[PDB]
Every structure is written in C-alpha cells, then in structure tokens.
Amino acid sequence: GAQSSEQTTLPSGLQIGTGVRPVATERLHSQGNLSQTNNSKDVAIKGQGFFQ
Amino acid sequence: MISSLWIAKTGLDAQQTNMDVIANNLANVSTNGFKRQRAVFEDLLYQTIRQP
C-alpha cells in the first residue's frame, strides 16, 4: 500500500512469513452412542450436562 | 469403535432379549395360572447433526 510512485501505490508487497504454531486443542462435546451394560448402577446422560 | 457397530450390537442384544422372552414363554406351557410375556422396544437417542 506504500506509494511506489508519485501517483501509484504498491499492491501486495513483500511479506516473508515464519512457520506454524498450534493455537488450541478443542474438544467435541457431542452425544456418544449408548452401550447397555446391564448394570443397575451405570448412568448415562442424554443432553449436555455433567455430574459433579 | 464405530457407531454402526454399537448400533448393531444393541440390536443384537435386543433380539436376544426377544428370543429369551420367547423361550421362557415356551418353557411354561404346562404351568397353571401363567401369563406369557411380551417385550416392548423403543428407539434410542437421535443425534442432531442438522436440526430439522
């Protein structure tokens, strides 16, 4: 964008870039398929809650 | 490991429950004052990839 001449501008100048970095590791909080273990004590959640 | 495998395993277990019910019904033909069983099934969870 710098003025290359008195009446013109420089389009898309010289950008030399460095490498790549990892930003973040995100989890996919979705509903997994249910498995029945025939146990009176095992509980499964259907929506978007957590046990405390 | 795969959603299809879990669904098919669940279907297998349900049909095995139906077979067990049928076998128990057949085993008690000569019992007096017996009421035969019938199993009722339902659809499991439905993941909403794209909301209808």
Added chain:
Amino acid sequence: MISSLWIAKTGLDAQQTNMDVIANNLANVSTNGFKRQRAVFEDLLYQTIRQPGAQSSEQTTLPSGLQIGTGVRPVATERLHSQGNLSQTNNSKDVAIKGQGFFQ
C-alpha cells in the same frame, strides 16, 4: 493435505453415515410404529479454474470448462411414513393407526 485425499475422506464419511443409517434401520425391526430412515446426499463445491462459457476469442466461447469438484455431503435423513403391517395381539389396550395421524 491434497485435494483428492479430502474428496475421498468426504466420500468415506458419507458411506459411513449411510452404514449408520442402515444399522439404525436394522436395530429397530421389532419396534412398533417405527418409520425407517433414508439419507440423501449432495455434491460439494466446485473449483472453477477456467470458467465454463468464458469468451476465449472475440467470438468463440469455451464449452464446459475445468470444473474440478470437491466431495459429497449428506443433506438430510428422511423418514418413510408408510402404513406398516398390522399385527393382532388381541389386547384391549393396544391401538393401531390406519391412516396418517399421531397420538398426542
């Protein structure tokens, strides 16, 4: 990391979704009042390269340019709301539907 690999990855995912639909249909054979599912797919975006119909010379157009396409995506899962076979259980409480209504 390369275009063909992404296209094939999308195809694999679509076929896996189809297999899940088939497995769900199989698991609910004994359920009462169940309507089977069917998955519908659509073809994904297109990399344009040469535009189809672009004027090459002053008078001659370019027919059917280089439309390199991407993979596939499933649009929807539709139920088949059709009257299933009625079974006689001879029970005073069991009710069956003959038309296209729903219980509330």
Added chain:
Amino acid sequence: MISSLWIAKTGLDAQQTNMDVIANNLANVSTNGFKRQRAVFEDLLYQTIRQPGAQSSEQTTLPSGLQIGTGVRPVATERLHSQGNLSQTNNSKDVAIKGQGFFQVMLPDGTSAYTRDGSFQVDQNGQLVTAGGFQVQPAITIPANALSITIGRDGVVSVTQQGQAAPVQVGQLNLTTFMNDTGLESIGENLYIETQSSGAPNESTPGLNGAGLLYQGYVETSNVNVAEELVNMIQVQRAYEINSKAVSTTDQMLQKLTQL
C-alpha cells in the same frame, strides 16, 4: 531452471488433476442424478527452433524440423449426460426423468437453478421443495389433507381428496431443456446454473420437444461406472510414478552439473 523439470512438473499436475476428477467421481456413487466427469488434455507450446518447411537448399526443403514441446495442460472437464439407472424408493414425492430434461428451482437470490435430482419434500406451507429447501417452479402447492399425490408421465400433478371421487389438479411439473447440457455451470447442491455456452432454457412439458418423461416413485442414480474408475486409478498412479521418475532423473542430471 531446466526445461525437462517444468515439463515433468506440468505432467505431474495433469495427473493430479486426473486423480482429483477420479476421486470426485468415486465420492458421488450414492448421489442421485450425478454425472461423471472427464478431463481433456492438450499439448502446451512448441519451441520452433528450425522452421519445418524452410529452404535448406535451392531445390530441397527441410522436412519436419526441430520442434521442442512444452508440457501438458487440461483443456476442460466434460460430463457424460446420459440416462442413469433408476431405483425404486417407493415414495410418492420422488420423481425420475427418463429423457433429457431438468427441473427448475428458485434460489433464495431469486435466480433460477436447474437440478436433475428428484428427491422432493413438502414444506410447512405445502410447496414442493427439494431436499435443500429450494422451491420448484412453478410453486406446485399441495392442499392441507392430501391422501395421495399422483404425478403423471406428462407432469400433471394431482391430489386425491377425501369424499371426492375425482382427483384435483394442483400444478404442472415442467422440464427445462438446453442446447448444450455440458455447458451448465455446476454450483454444488446438485444444482446447475445457466451460462452463455449452455444455450437458452427451453421450457416444455414432459413428452414433447424431446423433454423426458417423469416416473413417480423412482430416483435417477448416478451414472458412475466403478470399473473404469479403478482402471483409471491404476493409470493415474503409474503415470504419476513415471513422471516422478523423470523429475528424479532431471534432479540427478542437475546435481552432476553442480559437482563438476
């Protein structure tokens, strides 16, 4: 920096394009009304050096002089607009084309697109829309409590109401035909838009002017034939491998130049 390297690079790019087309064809096996793609290749420029036909002697000519060619580039991608095999889905809302016509739908922008896919639904308003929700043209609206929908071979859509012994007509499903079907621009979502190379949209009923016939309860599957795709994958892999070998040979030549 060396000619053979650029030529083999162009060859590698062409083979990668062929593999891309192959993968796109393979990923769309289950897509309804999909047409397979084919790539067309052409020679690149030709360095002239000696002019073929130049005057070598006063009474002799130079036959077929030294023309040095550049690599290869794809000309264009052409579809195979042919009738795909029909599949019975036993659904009153699915229509299949037997000839060479297209359904006209309206995009949300107001412009019209064309699709050969017949998987239709009915929205909350009753208008016949596609699987993505685009409204067919015209708005084949549907009454409230329909019992059955009958779409004839000539596009007449009728609804059977209760207590009425005669079916009522609620629309007329028409087909659009083009001078050049390969010139339609694919935009995804099984949708083709008009271009200047696809002629003009000729609106017509099913059965006249060439337009195809409509079958209710059937869907037009893709025309992709797998065995051709497998043999072409073998071809693409081996040609890519040969071109990579040529690149490697050029690399060794240049390295030997560097050592001296």
Added chain:
Amino acid sequence: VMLPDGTSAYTRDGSFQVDQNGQLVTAGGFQVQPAITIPANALSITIGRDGVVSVTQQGQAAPVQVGQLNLTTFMNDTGLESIGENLYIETQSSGAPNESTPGLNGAGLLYQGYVETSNVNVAEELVNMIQVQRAYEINSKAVSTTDQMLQKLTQL
C-alpha cells in the same frame, strides 16, 4: 478445424462438444470443418462409418441427415507444424491438404464412442532416460577432464 483468425488447422483428437448454437466444435471451442448443426429436438446423434451425421427427432421414424465429416489427408504427415493445442497446420513439407470422405482415397474410417489414445511407448522412454542421464554424466566428465588439463597447462 477453423481457427478464430480464419486459417484452418488439423487435429486428430476426436473429443467434440456441441456449442450453444448447435455446432460441433473441439474441446477448445473451435468449430470443426465442415459445418454440422444439431437441432434441439435431437434424441441421439449417430456418426456413420463414412462420416454421415444423422439426427433422430421425436416422432420421425427415419433419421435426418445433418452433415458430413470430411477427413483431410496429407501426403507427408510428419511435415506438419504442431501449433500447440492438439492442432497441426500445413507447411511447405506437407502441402496439398486433400479433403475426402472417410474410407475413400486412402482415408481412414470413423469409430464413434471411441477416442484414439497416445501412442507413447513407456519402456522405450525409461530406457532412453537412462541412456540420456549416463550420457550427460560422461560428457560432464569430459568437460571436467578438459578443465583440469587447462588448469595444469596454464599453471606453469
């Protein structure tokens, strides 16, 4: 094939497409000579053994002849100038382009639904690459030997 500037080129790539006004053209858009215009009411296009193009319209039980595919035969084929995009132009070594019907005057036949592929033999090219590479490595060594001889000579 008729080029935009009006001069005729010649091609053997038989992949054709119908443009927006009918008309058979090459994949690059150049119109093929002579003229075949295919109407809208066409159901199937058949190109015969002798280049006759017939178009079947609905209702008619007899196909309608549209055009003739004329093959241009040269007497010295290799003398043509390759102008790039799968096209050859005539030169002084391939003069007198003879229009003919396919199958007559030595011309070839036409098979519809098939395309002639490249005649490049692959093993020959790989062995030739081996020969070329080793040859460029023996000439480079000759260069190095001459350089060393010169260095030894001019050093004294």
Added chain:
Amino acid sequence: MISSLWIAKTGLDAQQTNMDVIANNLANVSTNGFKRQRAVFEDLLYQTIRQPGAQSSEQTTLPSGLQIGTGVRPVATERLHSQGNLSQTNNSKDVAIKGQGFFQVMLPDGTSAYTRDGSFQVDQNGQLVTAGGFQVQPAITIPANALSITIGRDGVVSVTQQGQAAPVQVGQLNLTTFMNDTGLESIGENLYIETQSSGAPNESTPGLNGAGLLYQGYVETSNVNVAEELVNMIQVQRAYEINSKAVSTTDQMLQKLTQL
C-alpha cells in the same frame, strides 16, 4: 498408458456389458411379451507393423505379418424374437399372439408404438387400452352394458348385451408385421417403435399373409431361460476375473520397469 492395459480395459467393459445383459434378462423373467437380449462383439483395430504379404525380397513374400491387435467392441444387443410359452390365465381381456405380429397402440404424443403384450384393460370411457393406459388401435370401444367379451382367432371383438341371443361386433383387431423385427427401438413399458432398419409397418389380419393368430384367455410369457443365464453368468464371471488378472499382470510389469 500402455497397450495391454487398454486392451484389458476393453475386455473388462465388454464383459461388464455381457453381465448387464444377463442381469436385465433375469430381472424380466416374468414380464409378459418379453424378448430377451443377446450381445454381440467384434474385434477392434489391428496395428499393421510388418504388413502381412509384404514383399521382403524380390521373389519371397512374408506370410502373416506382425498383426498386433487392439481389444474388443460390442456391435449391439439384438432381441431374440421367439415364441414365448402361452399361459392359460382364463380372463376375457387377455389375448396372446401365436405368430410373429404386433399390436398397434397410439402413444399420447400422436405417434404409434407396437407391443406384443396382450394384457388389455378398459378405461372409464370404454376403450381398450394397454395396462399402462395407452389406447389400442384402430380403437375398439366396449359398451357399459357388456356381459361378455369374445375375441376370436381373427381378431374380431364381439360384445353380447343383456337378453340378446346374438353378439354385437364392436371392432376388428389387426396385427402389424415388419420386415425386421430386431431393428425396432424399445422405448420401455413393453413398447417398441418403428426404426428405418425395421422397414415399414405392414398391417394385416390375423391368419392371412403372415400375421399371427390370437387366442383369448392366454398370455404370452417371456422366452428367457433361467439355466442358460446361470451358465452364462458363471462363464462371464470367469472371463471378467481373468481379464482383471491380465490388468493386474500389466500393472505389476509397469511397477518393476518404473522402479528400475
């Protein structure tokens, strides 16, 4: 990319065509008035190399020169026009042909197709129609007050009204015959249309100069033979597998060469 690959890529396609013909024949094993298909193949190009019969010396000729050939192409699938077995399903509206003639039916667009299917119905207006709703020719109307329909061996359709001891003639059914029955173009729905290779439609009465005979209460079944189709599947499968093995051998040969 190599010659044997193209040749074995034509072999695969020809065997796939043979399997398609077999599967289509087996799928329509029960449709009435069906004629099964047979695919025919022919040799492709033959590269001359050394010309056969070339004059090597001034007195010795070269016998059977180096004629390297290309793959195979199918000419066409021809319909095996034979008389299917007649079945007595005892309905007055089913008629079967005994010779080599065809029924003429008027298509909605005004043109005439030709069908050998004899399962006829009566529309709401009383005309004889094909089960697909196409009206037969030269139009045979049936009154509402009809007690019995009698179609004789000569195609005369008679209707007996109530309390009347004499039948009433309501038309005359005629059969169309062609010079070449194979050249007819099948348009589906058990319908064939005339093509220039099928000559011209010669209308004739059933028993004269070559039209067949009509039997009432009979249906003409298909001529497809299941056991022969099974054996042909077993042989086509083996041929396809062997050609695929040729493809694989070519692929392996190209691997070692490139690796070198």
Added chain:
Amino acid sequence: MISSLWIAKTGLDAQQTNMDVIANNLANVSTNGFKRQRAVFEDLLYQTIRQPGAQSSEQTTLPSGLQIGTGVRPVATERLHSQGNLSQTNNSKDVAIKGQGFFQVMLPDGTSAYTRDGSFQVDQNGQLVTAGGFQVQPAITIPANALSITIGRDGVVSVTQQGQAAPVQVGQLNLTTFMNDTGLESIGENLYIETQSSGAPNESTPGLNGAGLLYQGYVETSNVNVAEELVNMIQVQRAYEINSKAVSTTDQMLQKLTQL
C-alpha cells in the same frame, strides 16, 4: 550408448509385444468366429568380430569363433485356424462352419471381405447381412412374408411361405477357401481380406472338395484356451522381470564408470 542396454531394451519390447498379443487374445473370448494369435520371435544380428573357421594357425582353424549377438525381434503373429466348439443359440439366422471355409461380404467401398462369424440378420429390404450391416454375397433375398428360413448342410437357403407345402429357394450360400488361410489381412470387425500371401479365393459349395458344412442355429465361438493364457501371462511377467533386472544391472555398471 552401451550394447547390453540396447539388447535388454529389445528384449523388453518383445516381451511387451507378447503381453499385448496375450491381452488381445483374452479380450476376444466372447467374440464368435475368432482365432487366437501367437507371436514368433527371431534373434537380431550377430557381430562378426573373429570369423569362425578362419586359420587359427598355419595347420589349424578356429572352431566356433567370437560372435556377439544383438537382441531379439518379433517375426510375425500367426493365427490358429482351428474349429472352435459350437454353441446352440437356437436362432434360424445364426450359421456356423464345421470345416475350413469363409463367408464373403461386400464392403461399402465395393471390395470383397471374408468373415467366418455367422451371426446374420436381415435388413429393412430383406437381404441377409452381418451384424455390421455388410451384405453377405452372393446376395440372399428373404421375402416379406417368410415363416421359417431353412439353411441346409450344403448351403441352400429356403423359405416356407404360407399355405404352400413346398419351400421356395431364395439363394445359395457358398464358402471361399484360400490355400494360405493364415495369410489373410485382418481389418478388425471379424473381417479378413485377401493378400498376395493368402493365394486366391476359391469359391466352393459347403460340403464339396473341402469347404465346411453349414449348421443352422449354431455359432462358432473363439478357440482361445484360457488356462494357457494364464500360464503364458506368468511366463511373460517373469521374463519382463528378468529383462528389467538386466537393464538395472547395466545402469549400475555405467554408474561406477561415471564415478571413475
């Protein structure tokens, strides 16, 4: 640039030609009236260097001196003109040959070609033609109202008309025999033409001095033996392996000389 590399290249080309012949033979398995081809090779030139039989010493000669051979080249591909097994297609127009004769057809150019395939049809005018539409000579004209066509063992074509207990003869099918049957030039399309190495076409009746007997309802399938083709494919693959290894070994030797 080095002799062993040229020799191994010639070997590779010969093995590729053998594989091409094998693939062509396997691609035409379903073709009727097809004859399998076999290629024959000859070794290339022999460098003289030391003339054998020369005087090794005043009283002795050199036994079997130093001859250095070049690669290999294919001489010719010979057909195997043998009777393939007959197949019953139960068609009145299919004709098979039991002996050593050929059918004669006329190309559109006016010249005469020869074909052994007997899958015949009838055109729109009534003449007996092949599957490619070429008219079988001598012209056999089938009339409009034919009921059955009978072709006997000696080549007489008879038509039985309606109401006439005697059959009407409408032609005479002859067979052409050549002294050298393998010398014919195959143009594809199951057609062979006469060359100067195939002698002259001798017309003869089918049953006379060596023309074969004509069977109606039979087709002569190809004589390709497939297990032999699989074994030969194994052989060709291994030979190509060994030749490629020779090329690679020569490549490794020249490398050490470059390094020198």
Added chain:
Amino acid sequence: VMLPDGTSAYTRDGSFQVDQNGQLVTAGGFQVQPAITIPANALSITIGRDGV
C-alpha cells in the same frame, strides 16, 4: 506499461495484480496500458486467447 515519468516501457513478465481503484498493474505497481478495470462484484476473471 506506463512509467512514472509518462513514457511507455515494455515487459514480458506476465504476473499482474489489481490495485485498490480497480485497474491492472504489474508486480512493481506500474499501471498497464490499455487501462483494464476489473469491477468489485467480480466472481471470476477470465483472460481469453485473444486478450479479451
């Protein structure tokens, strides 16, 4: 190509860009004559065989 002083030079480097007021310019920013101005709502720019 139009130099800053106003005289016309000539180039064979075919790597062109477009600047912020439309207009085709070279990699250095000099504007190419004749003056070709690509609009903003462009979806795809095609440069034909004959320079159209």
Added chain:
Amino acid sequence: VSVTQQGQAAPVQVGQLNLTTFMNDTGLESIGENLYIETQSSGAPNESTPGL
C-alpha cells in the same frame, strides 16, 4: 519398396534401394552433416542391390 493401395490385394512396386560399397571404407572423407565423400584411398564406389 512396395506400398499398399486401397482395394488392391497386391502391392505396387515403387523402387529399389541400392547400397554403395567401397573397397577401403576407412579411407572415406567425413564431411560433417553425416555424409562421407569418396577419397583417393576409398575409390571405386560400386553400386549394388543389397544382399548381392
């Protein structure tokens, strides 16, 4: 040199390619453009039909 003409089951004889043999081939003068000219040490160019 024989050629095949359409419809002609026989080839048409066009010409004979004669080979020239010298006595001392090593004495020829190599003039450049892959050509040898006769030199007094390689005289007597004898034309012959190849094979004879």
Added chain:
Amino acid sequence: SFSQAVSGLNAAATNLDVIGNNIANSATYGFKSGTASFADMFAGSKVGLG
C-alpha cells in the same frame, strides 16, 4: 448392473407378496385374487434398466 438385478428382486418380492395375500384369503367371502403385471424400463435400447 446392480440396480437392474435389485429391480428384479423387488418384482419377485411383489409377486410373492401377492401370492401370500391370495393364499391368506383362501376362505374369505367376496375376495377377488390379485395379479401383478410387469413391464420393462428400456431407456434407448441396447441397454436395460430393469
């Protein structure tokens, strides 16, 4: 060539459905049997669709 055979399988299933329905109504006053009729789906000749 998979859809072609799938269509034949569906036709055979429909025939067997009709036969089973007819058999189940062997003793049912006022019942009239059913019969399924089939027609091919040729597209442009030389190829079948089922």
Added chain:
Amino acid sequence: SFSQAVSGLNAAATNLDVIGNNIANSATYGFKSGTASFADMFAGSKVGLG
C-alpha cells in the same frame, strides 16, 4: 469343457421337456408320444464338440 458340458446340459433339458410333454398329454385323444434322438458332433476325430 464348458462348451462340451453345456451341450449335454441342453440335450438333457430337451429330453426332459419331451418327457414332460408326453406326461402332460396323458389324456389327449389322438396324441402321439415323442422321443428325442441325439448324435455326437465330432470334428477332427481327436476333438469332440459335444
């Protein structure tokens, strides 16, 4: 051996069809029973064709 066996299969099928036609016409006045005659199809004398 897949063309020599197919011929025998077809011959046996023809014989069985003839036998079935004889059985079906057990009660048909003026009917004459039918029989099938088979002959080999040798070629050279070392190559049988079925």
Added chain:
Amino acid sequence: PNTVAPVGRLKLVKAEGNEVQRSDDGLFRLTAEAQAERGAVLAADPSIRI
C-alpha cells in the same frame, strides 16, 4: 508457415591462407598476387556449405 519463400543467397567464397591478408580493420582482403590471378572480386563457390 506455407508463406516461407527464398529471398537471397549469401556469398560464400573459398580462399587459402596464402591468398588473403588482414587489413587494418580486421577484415581479410585478397593479396596483390592473388588478386591479379583471381580477379578483383571472388566468385562464389557453389561447393561451400554452412
């Protein structure tokens, strides 16, 4: 490329070392004795190839 036509022929002469002398501008010219025998201008030799 059909337009290619001859325009002119370069003059190629044959001269040994003993006949030519390098002028002060580096261009060789015929010596006096050689010029007197071969003429003022050297005729083109048709045997010269370039």
